[PDB]
Write an enzyme that holds these catalytic residues in place. Structure first.
Site, PDB file in Angstrom:
ATOM      1  CE  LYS A 164      -1.303  -0.478   4.197  1.00 56.79           C
ATOM      2  NZ  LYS A 164      -0.041  -1.120   4.657  1.00 56.79           N
ATOM      3  CB  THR A 165       3.012   2.735   2.711  1.00 58.99           C
ATOM      4  OG1 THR A 165       2.048   2.528   3.757  1.00 58.99           O
ATOM      5  CG2 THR A 165       3.763   4.043   2.984  1.00 58.99           C
ATOM      6  CG  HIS A 198      -0.921  -1.486  13.034  1.00 58.27           C
ATOM      7  ND1 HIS A 198      -0.192  -1.770  11.898  1.00 58.27           N
ATOM      8  CD2 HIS A 198      -0.172  -1.920  14.078  1.00 58.27           C
ATOM      9  CE1 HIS A 198       0.945  -2.350  12.239  1.00 58.27           C
ATOM     10  NE2 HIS A 198       0.982  -2.452  13.556  1.00 58.27           N
TER      11      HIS A 198
END
Ligand SMILES: C/C=C\C=C\[C@@H]1O[C@](O)([C@H](CC)C(=O)NC/C=C/C=C(\C)[C@@H](OC)[C@@H](C)[C@@H]2O[C@H](/C=C/C=C/C=C(\C)C(=O)c3c(O)cc[nH]c3=O)[C@H](O)[C@@H]2O)[C@H](O)[C@H](O)C1(C)C
Ligand SMILES: Nc1nc2c(ncn2[C@@H]2O[C@H](COP(=O)(O)OP(=O)(O)O)[C@@H](O)[C@H]2O)c(=O)[nH]1
Ligand SMILES: [Zn+2]
Lengths: 83, 208, 99, 385
Positions: free
Chosen positions: D24-25, D65
């Site tokens: 993702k990031t 998270h």
RNA sequence: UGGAGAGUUUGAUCCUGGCUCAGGGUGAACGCUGGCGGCGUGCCUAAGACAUGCAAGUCGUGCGGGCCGCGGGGUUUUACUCCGUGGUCAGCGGCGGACGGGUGAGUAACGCGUGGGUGACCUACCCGGAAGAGGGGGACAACCCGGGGAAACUCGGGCUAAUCCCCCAUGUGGACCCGCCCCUUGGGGUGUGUCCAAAGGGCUUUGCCCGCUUCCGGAUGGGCCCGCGUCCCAUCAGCUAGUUGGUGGGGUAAUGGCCCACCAAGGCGACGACGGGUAGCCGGUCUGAGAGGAUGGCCGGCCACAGGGGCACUGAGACACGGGCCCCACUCCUACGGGAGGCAGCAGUUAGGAAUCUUCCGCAAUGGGCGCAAGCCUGACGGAGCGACGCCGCUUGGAGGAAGAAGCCCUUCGGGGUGUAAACUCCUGAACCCGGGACGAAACCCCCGACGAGGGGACUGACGGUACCGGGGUAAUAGCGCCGGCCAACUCCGUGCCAGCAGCCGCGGUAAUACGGAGGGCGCGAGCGUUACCCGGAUUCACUGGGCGUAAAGGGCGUGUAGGCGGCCUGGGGCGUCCCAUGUGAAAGACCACGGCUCAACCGUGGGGGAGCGUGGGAUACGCUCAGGCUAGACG
RNA sequence: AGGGGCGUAGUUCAAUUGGUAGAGCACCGGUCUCCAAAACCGGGUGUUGGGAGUUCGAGUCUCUCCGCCCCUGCCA
């Protein structure tokens, strides 16, 4: 140099100038050298302009530079008119 | 703004029968003709000896209640009367009387002052030609008050200008019944106004 | 980012350098005169002192020493110079010093 | 030295999801550097952007998270579709689960699963196996899993190819194209919802900034209507009372916007407003449009264990956290004489008593979460206070 | 044209005396509540830090070039592109960037107030007068080329124009040394000897307009100096070496130890030196019967400062807010060698704080700079916006309408109260709607007359399609404090020294007009209360206007320094004192009269006060001083 | 927005042996008084911060919220 202009008095939406021989640099409404007359631009009174005859001329005969729209009034008051 | 509210209630409280309605406050029920005692749950009970303060407070309230003026305005007039030359007593009354809205009532047109106010406020009145809608307008001597043309037909201006058939006006005001006019001839005096009020005692209220 | 003020700085440095020189001249030239006016060099003293006096009124022409600033420098020269000559030695060539 | 922003192509909000430490990031840092060649001028959510050739983009790179749910869950509601990332090294790990089921709870239409980390351990099955487990997991959560653009490619490699030389046109890398495959194929499939600019203004607040020299800026995606400089607004919710001011600045992705319509994360400088005076859970709206409230009745449906929820029911006097928009405030539950044992799978209509005033409004929907699980969801009925 | 007191020490009294209250005020803030308009007004704190955009330019009628669009192709074609004419980018040169605008940090001082001095001085542009403007040479930019550089920009060679610079002459005149006369601090005249001027530009061209030069005077603005006035601590008592004076110099526009040599030892201080704290000063403002006290925000004058600190250049003027140099702190760029900036300008941010606004519109008006002018620039300014922050005006309705609905509250269960209040009936018509729609603007300029006087003509409005006028038109907001006394206003229930109230006295311990609610009432109203501070009341620092036997207060007593005070008669002086004239005492504010916005608030015109202090003239009772005399005080 | 702490009667504190909640100051009634203090009789007076989860049962072990402190985040 010394001049002859209009210092604004009266109030908001109610101009009421005071014809005066201040000094060029002075702020418009600052300390003037001598009041010679006034002018009501809305002629809301049968005397919307008066000028000191003898005096306006004095200052003129010594270097007082009339303002543009100022002279217009001195003239209308019969300052220069020599006949 | 101006009071707006139970009024004979004041007619009562103050002791003196006041006219804040014009018609009714004049009949067999200004309330002062039924319950000549203060309002509230008590009102009709042992009235303790009024303190020097109370006395003045009441006297002043009486006067200012008659003209339905606000405390602010009311005070200014008074202070204004002081500075001006002459007995503050009269002068004050004078100024008070010069009030347009009131001058109107004084000349017929309006049955009461609360009504006289709505007239001046809604236009219907005139001063030396042009119309003034400021109830507080102060009428000077020589000025002629008059109903507006568009007004001259209204259902009220009639009746109220009708009852003026005969009834004379104060020696300080003239009146042309047909041509809805009227002039403020002179400034009214302590005498001319037979008011149930002690002025020189109201002047005391504004000291300590 | 900038302004036509610069036009004044450049202009500044220039004439700052103009009368800067015109000035130091009158100076080195005023001493040279007195430096002799006491030796006895009567003639060439006035010769120089007459030159100095020129350069002085010269700067006075422009924005260098205008008016009295010049007048004074002169008085003090036609003063110190004469005051040294009458220290034994008549005034030769007419020069500037008024007889 | 600022630069204006001009409109033409439609706007759309997206944001990568998936398991933590997958892709993702970075792929986000990939998509960006990519659409910057043929298009001149390009622990905490990172709203960033890239413009293709058919539309304008937002994109949210939420941390993710079992700790930063709250931060995450927000950004989801503000998007029209997610790019579920999956690593060919591990597969459908727990976080990947959590995110999807969550991405579903918060509405959200269609998904574009990008198979990142393709460039690792070559396997006939693996690559093709993954495409299975996903579609099995997506439908296992009622998603169109059997028809969800599944592009494959390694972002890490794609990016490192960009740092060498900026400009890099279509497919000049058997790599810099699977991204152009996802990027291209992304503006496809996932449509463009109906943005209604007729309704009164209202923009929930996500983050609030204090821009040196200018003031406090409130960022959020306008939910209806539009705002330009000189527009009066109201900061309704979470405060003594609702403060009113005028907007004097509107911008799209760090750039002077002209009239920001509905459905676009725009920042707005508010006239004379201190920073501690504006926070999330608030909403900038049109004067008079919606007010602050504490108590209300709602038609809530309580999910059953099967679908996450409780499995014991709750009596009157329960304290969960209700989510309205960019917010999450707590509240007590007090309802009808009876309805006591309101166990799982019911459509009761109780009354909330939030301890913090929030811009309630009959018609608005919400959700309930207690004990790390969406215990319920519904909509505002009648307003008491 | 002007003065009000009350509560509280006691069982009670009178006195003393402190505390507290009613009044007015504010750049306010806080609470509850909040409809309109007009005029005011809005960082009181961190002189903290600040993104961005703007706040200062203008002249081609001073001068030479580049470059773009066009008259006609130099030649016969695009050759040495002359020049035509309007543009535009800088450069050169000029005038203005020293004003206008911001702030109150510093400053207890000739900073300011005030009245004077300058024989010790300056003043660009502006008027008035006098005489001029004749010759000549030269440079640097720009531009061409070469060079280092990330940039900002910088170096070199070489053309070139001027109102840029320099040499010579003319000397009306002026400057300087010496002599002389008048005059008196360095001013005015004169003689001899030196030294000093200047620029051409546009035309409608032996004439104008704009400049140039030297001189004299007027104006206006300033420098310097001086008398008097200007806060707290004496638990601060002695301070001083450029210190105080001199002589000769340097310096300046000019006096001066301003600075420097040398000499002399002074200068200052209880009349408060030196030191410490605080503070910009004033016109004024608030309060006050007044005398006073408090204060110095907006407006006007003066001073001081421009991130902190030092410095000079240019210049009529600055040691310069948007100029320069250097150091420092902090912010940012860097190709790491050097670069960039300073909102106490307008607007906006952030920090601090109880708290203080739009990154608005317009140069239409007034005012400023430059220009022959057209005109350009102008966050000065004219306006609009936001905030009940203030003052003034306006509205939430008017007239009817019951021995009197309901509801709620009391109740001697008959009834009383809210209450003409409502309902209801008529009536007017804030808003809103349609239509019309300003004043502020007449001059610069053009034309007849000479571009003079005078006459005529044209353009120009940000606020605004706003004010205001006409027609149409709906019953259309009310809250806050208080009700034991002071102080206007009382009952029920709850509570039971609890909960709570409280400005002072004090309320609350199971019948609380004192707590909390209710009904009711009083006060004020788009407001009402609260807190903070100033004056008042407080004759409670007492000049007006107090006191000390016992209330707080007589020094333990002498002797005496400075100081204060001083019997009787007479004369000179005329310092105090008093009187007349005269100059000053800006404007605004205040007051009074009259006007203009429908009133008012705001605002204009005019009018009248006035201590102080300068000058001239006068008085001489009293004070003072000088002189003569006296004997009642005192001493011998 | 994310980490980590704390929170039990009115008030300081107990059961880290998971089986209802206990100690001193303090307070509340009773006798007594006008009402207290004192003396004597007799009383735990608790939203274990809320709400859910495991458990046969939770102050204790899990979660998710609330308020407070502390560490980092944060220019459309
Ligand atoms: C949830 C957090 C915030 C929500 C905020 C708001 O929600 C909303 O109010 C929303 C409006 C409807 C809302 O109320 N959301 C609130 C609720 C919405 C609920 C909707 C849709 C459902 O339907 C019953 C929907 C998910 C449904 O469930 C099924 C899933 C069952 C899963 C069982 C779990 C399984 C296997 C599992 O392994 C599992 C797990 O997942 C978690 C933990 N441990 C596990 O072991 C299926 O996939 C269906 O699709 C609006 O969207 C707002 O705008 C919003 C975004 C601000
Ligand atoms: N094997 C592989 N690793 C990748 C790929 N893309 C990113 N990574 C790496 O995976 C790790 C985590 O990636 P990241 O972008 O942080 O994923 P997220 O932050 O969890 O969404 C980093 O080391 C990345 O460089 C890829 O395509 N293939
Ligand atoms: Zn009556």
């Amino acid at each position: 140099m010394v001049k002859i202009r209009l210092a604004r008095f009266g109030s908001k939406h109610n101009p009421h100038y005071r014809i005066v021989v201040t000094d060029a640099r002075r702020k418009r409404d600052g300390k003037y050298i001598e009041k010679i007359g006034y002018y009501d631009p809305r002629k809301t009174t049968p005397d919307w302009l008066k000028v000191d005859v003898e005096r306006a001329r004095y200052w003129l005969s010594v270097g007082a530079q009339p303002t543009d729209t100022a002279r217009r009034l001195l003239r209308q008051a019969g300052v220069f008119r020599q006949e | 703004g101006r009071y707006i509210g139970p009024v004979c209630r004041l007619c009562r409280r103050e002791g003196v029968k006041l006219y804040l309605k014009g018609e009714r406050c004049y009949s067999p029920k200004c309330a002062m003709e039924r319950r000549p005692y203060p309002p509230g749950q008590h009102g009709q009970k042992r009235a303790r000896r009024p303190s020097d303060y109370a006395v003045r407070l009441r006297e002043k309230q009486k006067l200012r209640r008659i003209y339905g003026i606000s405390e602010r305005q009311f005070r200014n007039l008074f202070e204004e009367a002081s500075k001006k030359k002459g007995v503050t007593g009269s002068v004050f009354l004078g100024l008070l009387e010069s009030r347009l809205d009131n001058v109107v009532y004084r000349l017929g047109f309006a049955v009461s002052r609360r009504q006289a106010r709505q007239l001046v406020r809604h236009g219907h009145i005139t001063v030396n030609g042009r119309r003034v809608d400021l109830p507080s307008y102060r009428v000077r001597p020589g000025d002629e008050i008059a109903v507006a043309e568009k007004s001259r037909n209204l259902e009220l201006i009639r009746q109220n200008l009708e009852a003026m058939k005969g009834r004379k006006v104060g020696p300080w005001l003239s009146l042309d019944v047909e041509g809805m006019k009227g002039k403020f001839l002179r400034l009214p005096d302590r005498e001319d106004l037979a008011l149930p009020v002690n002025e020189q005692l109201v002047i005391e209220f504004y000291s300590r | 980012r900038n302004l036509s003020a610069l036009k004044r700085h450049r202009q500044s440095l220039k004439r700052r350098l103009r009368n800067k020189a015109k000035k130091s001249a009158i100076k080195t030239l005023s001493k040279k005169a007195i430096q002799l006016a006491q030796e006895g060099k009567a003639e060439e003293a006035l010769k120089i002192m007459r030159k100095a006096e020129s350069l002085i009124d010269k700067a006075a022409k422009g924005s260098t020493l205008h008016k009295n600033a010049a007048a004074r420098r002169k008085s003090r020269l036609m003063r110190k110079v004469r005051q040294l000559l009458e220290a034994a030695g008549a005034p030769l060539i007419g020069g500037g010093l008024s007889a | 030295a600022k630069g204006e922003f001009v409109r033409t192509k439609p706007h759309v909000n997206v944001g990568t999801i998936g398991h933590v430490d997958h892709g993702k990031t970075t792929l986000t840092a990939a998509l960006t550097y990519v659409a910057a060649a043929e298009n001149p001028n390009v622990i905490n959510t990172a709203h960033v952007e890239y413009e293709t050739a058919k539309r304008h983009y937002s994109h949210v790179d939420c941390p993710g998270h079992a700790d930063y749910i709250k931060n995450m869950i927000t950004g989801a509601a503000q998007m029209d579709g997610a790019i579920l990332v999956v690593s060919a090294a591990d597969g459908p790990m727990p976080q990947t689960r959590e995110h999807i089921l969550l991405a579903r709870q918060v509405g959200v239409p269609y998904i574009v699963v990008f198979m990142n980390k393709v460039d690792m351990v070559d396997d006939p099955e693996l690559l093709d196996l993954v495409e299975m487990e996903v579609r099995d997991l997506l439908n296992q959560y009622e998603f169109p899993g059997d028809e969800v653009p599944v592009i494959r490619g390694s972002a890490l490699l794609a990016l490192e190819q960009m740092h060498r030389n900026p400009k890099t046109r279509r497919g000049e890398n058997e790599w810099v194209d699977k991204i152009w495959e996802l990027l291209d194929a992304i503006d496809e499939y996932i449509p463009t919802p109906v943005r209604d600019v007729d309704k009164p203004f209202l923009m929930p607040v996500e983050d609030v900034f204090t821009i040196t020299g200018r003031g406090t800026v409130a960022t959020g995606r306008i939910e209806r209507g539009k705002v330009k400089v000189g527009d009066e607004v109201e900061i309704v919710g979470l405060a003594p009372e609702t403060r009113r001011t005028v907007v004097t600045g509107v911008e799209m992705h760090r750039k002077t916007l002209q009239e920001g319509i509905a459905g676009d994360n725009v920042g707005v400088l508010l006239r004379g407003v201190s920073r501690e005076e504006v926070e999330r859970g608030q909403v900038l709206a049109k004067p008079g449009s919606i007010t602050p409230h504490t108590k209300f009745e709602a038609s809530v449906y309580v999910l059953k264990k099967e679908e996450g929820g409780r499995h014991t029911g709750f009596f009157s006097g329960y304290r969960p956290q209700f989510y309205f928009r960019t917010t999450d405030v707590t509240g007590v539950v007090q309802l009808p004489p009876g309805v006591e044992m309101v166990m799982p799978g019911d459509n009761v209509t109780f009354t909330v008593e939030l301890i913090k005033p929030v811009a309630l409004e009959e018609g608005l929907r919400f959700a309930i979460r207690e004990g790390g699980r969406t215990v319920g969801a519904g909509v505002v009925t009648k307003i008491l206070e």
